[PDB]
């Protein structure tokens, strides 16, 4: 109802003490019975709340759905981000971020169950299925030249790669420039976009889409044998609100570094990280198709690559098949 | 009325010759003195229409006033534009734009005769005096890498300064890298943005606003000196239609140099243009202020300068003061 997610909010707020029927109803000054209401609509959409008669109401776990209530929790304990926004569906968290920051400096990020017309890199088609991946737009400001747009993206790689291998028990590789991948699995994409002009940097827009809770049914088999999801990688139930947690607090560690650091402080890092080592890549450049080896990352994050004719190139970005 | 545009067209279609009531009317299936109330309200918002027993209607003349039902004409001859929106207020092209260009390829423009938050570079205040100037903002869609912002605007520097000079009878000049001036006074600014990642640009928005009937009351006294108009320096009327017409086929036509040309073909000529050389600059960078002599424009748009203290600087971008 009006009152769902400010109920749910009590309930969050209060782990892991129980707070009474009353105590909901005097706080947001509504019946008791009403409140009755509402915690049976939340049981029924799969929270897990332990009611007892006398001593009221607890919030065990939510269900794969997310809930602007418990959201804007997280949202007002932020270093980072001004609010968030959240939907069941949409056509796009990119396209709403791109419209949501026009005319003001707000930091935010825009999460939705699915999305109708999920987008990845080059305008390909990104399945964005309801219930089964957190689908991200971050917005961010920081005021650098439009330049770093590169180099944002490989702090942030490490950022995603590292809360999500907390979570997998198999390791985690980034496959630059944009893709993190579990065994053969790709398991994220990200999409660092910008607003800039000469002056400067006006907004950034990372897109990221994590795969969460797919069976491997799940996929169109046609991607079956490239595709995988966290869960196929946690012996637990993987918590979709724990896991946001986590990758905010990645996100803003590796931001951080990226208004503090070189990328040569974090460049053998990244490397350690990678996937694209001694093996052979596919490139694709408008309409040219090679292969090639990466030899090498630059203090700068260019990709060094030799192609199959003893070439040599200094890619800062490219589109790479294993 | 529901009709005003309709009508509008229609005349406008039409010129050098007259067209009945009676054929305006089985044109848009309504009464004949509806289509006489409208040409009515036309006539009193200021229109120039000879009205002739037995001939009909001929538009002589617009005023300060944009039209949707006029700039549609341009539109559909338009070998660039998709569309364009045309408002009598807004708070700012710039932000309409940046609104408008996401979820689509669309190339189009915005004008409004008024904008109640116009901002210019660094976000400074933009005067935008309602029957007054020209306030677009135009969004293109060149595919070329993020690097390539810098090298649009020098094209389009040159786009803008060729039309307003066609109607100036006083040297129009570039002040790089966004300023059009005539004498002393900056009759115009325009600001490119662009949304963009590192596979490309998304879209271009270029802002101009140019001051077209301003007399000199009309700036606040404190600008008076280094602002000035088009019809400060026009012995005919300035029509504010036949302007966008020129500015709209220089920004084609600078459009297409700028796809097909590196900066080094115009290099001479927007040398010849500007009117940086042989004086002493003021230079701004967040917190730090300089003075120096801007001795070369190099291949690639790069500002040579010479500061107060003989080191040389390289410059992409400035903000500069004379
Ligand atoms: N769930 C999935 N897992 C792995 N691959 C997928 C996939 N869905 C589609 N694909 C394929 O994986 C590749 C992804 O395309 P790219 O490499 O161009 O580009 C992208 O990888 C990154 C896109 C990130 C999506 C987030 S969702 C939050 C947000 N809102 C947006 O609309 N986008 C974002 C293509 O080959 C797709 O066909
Ligand atoms: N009408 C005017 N003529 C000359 N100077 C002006 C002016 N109005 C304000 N100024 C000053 O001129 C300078 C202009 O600022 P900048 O150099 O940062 O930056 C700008 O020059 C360019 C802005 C272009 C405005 C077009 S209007 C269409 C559109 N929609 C938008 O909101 N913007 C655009 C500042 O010193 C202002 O205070």
Same mark, same amino acid.
């Given at each position: 109802?009006?009152?769902?997610?400010?109920?749910?909010?009590?309930?969050?707020?209060?782990?892991?003490?129980?707070?009474?029927?009353?105590?909901?109803?005097?706080?947001? #000054?509504?019946?008791?019975?009403?409140? %009755?209401? &509402?915690?049976?609509?939340? %049981?029924?959409?799969?929270?897990?709340?332990?009611?007892? #008669?006398?001593?009221?109401?607890?919030?065990?776990?939510?269900?794969?759905?997310?809930?602007?209530?418990?959201?804007?929790?997280?949202?007002?304990?932020?270093?980072?981000?001004?609010?968030?926004?959240?939907?069941?569906?949409?056509?796009?968290?990119?396209?709403?971020?791109?419209?949501?920051?026009?005319?003001?400096?707000?930091? =935010?990020?825009?999460?939705?169950? /699915?999305?109708?017309?999920?987008?990845?890199? =080059?305008?390909?088609?990104?399945?964005?299925?309801?219930?089964?991946?957190?689908?991200?737009? +971050?917005?961010?400001?920081?005021? &650098?030249?439009?330049?770093?747009?590169?180099?944002? #993206?490989?702090?942030?790689?490490?950022?995603?790669?590292?809360?999500?291998?907390?979570?997998?028990?198999?390791?985690?590789? &980034? %496959?630059?420039?944009?893709?993190?991948?579990?065994?053969?699995? %790709? +398991?994220?994409?990200?999409?660092?976009?910008?607003?800039?002009?000469?002056?400067?940097? /006006?907004?950034?827009?990372?897109?990221?889409?994590?795969?969460?809770?797919?069976?491997? /049914? $799940?996929?169109?088999?046609?991607?079956?044998?490239?595709?995988?999801?966290?869960?196929?990688?946690?012996?637990?139930?993987?918590?979709?609100?724990?896991?946001?947690?986590?990758?905010?607090?990645?996100?803003?560690?590796?931001?951080?570094? =990226?208004?503090?650091?070189?990328?040569?402080?974090?460049?053998? /890092?990244? $490397?350690?990280?990678? #996937?694209?080592?001694?093996?052979?890549?596919?490139?694709?450049?408008?309409?040219?198709?090679?292969?090639?080896?990466?030899?090498?990352?630059?203090?700068?994050?260019?990709?060094? &690559?030799?192609?199959?004719?003893?070439?040599?190139?200094?890619?800062?970005?490219?589109?790479?098949? =294993?």
């Amino acid at each position: 109802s009006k009152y769902s997610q400010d109920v749910l909010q009590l309930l969050y707020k209060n782990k892991p003490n129980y707070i009474s029927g009353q105590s909901i109803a005097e706080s947001l #000054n509504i019946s008791r019975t009403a409140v %009755k209401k &509402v915690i049976d609509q939340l %049981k029924l959409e799969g929270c897990k709340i332990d009611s007892v #008669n006398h001593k009221g109401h607890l919030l065990q776990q939510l269900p794969d759905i997310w809930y602007q209530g418990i959201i804007d929790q997280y949202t007002k304990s932020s270093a980072l981000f001004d609010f968030s926004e959240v939907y069941d569906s949409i056509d796009s968290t990119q396209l709403a971020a791109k419209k949501s920051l026009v005319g003001n400096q707000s930091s =935010f990020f825009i999460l939705s169950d /699915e999305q109708t017309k999920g987008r990845g890199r =080059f305008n390909r088609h990104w399945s964005s299925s309801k219930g089964q991946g957190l689908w991200m737009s +971050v917005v961010l400001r920081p005021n &650098v030249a439009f330049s770093m747009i590169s180099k944002f #993206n490989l702090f942030i790689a490490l950022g995603i790669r590292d809360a999500i291998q907390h979570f997998s028990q198999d390791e985690v590789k &980034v %496959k630059w420039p944009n893709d993190i991948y579990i065994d053969n699995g %790709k +398991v994220c994409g990200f999409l660092t976009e910008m607003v800039a002009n000469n002056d400067g940097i /006006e907004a950034i827009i990372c897109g990221i889409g994590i795969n969460l809770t797919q069976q491997l /049914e $799940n996929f169109d088999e046609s991607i079956r044998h490239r595709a995988t999801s966290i869960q196929l990688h946690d012996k637990n139930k993987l918590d979709r609100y724990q896991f946001l947690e986590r990758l905010l607090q990645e996100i803003e560690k590796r931001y951080n570094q =990226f208004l503090t650091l070189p990328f040569s402080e974090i460049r053998e /890092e990244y $490397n350690a990280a990678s #996937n694209i080592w001694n093996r052979t890549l596919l490139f694709t450049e408008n309409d040219k198709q090679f292969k090639g080896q990466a030899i090498d990352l630059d203090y700068d994050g260019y990709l060094i &690559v030799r192609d199959e004719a003893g070439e040599s190139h200094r890619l800062i970005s490219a589109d790479i098949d =294993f």
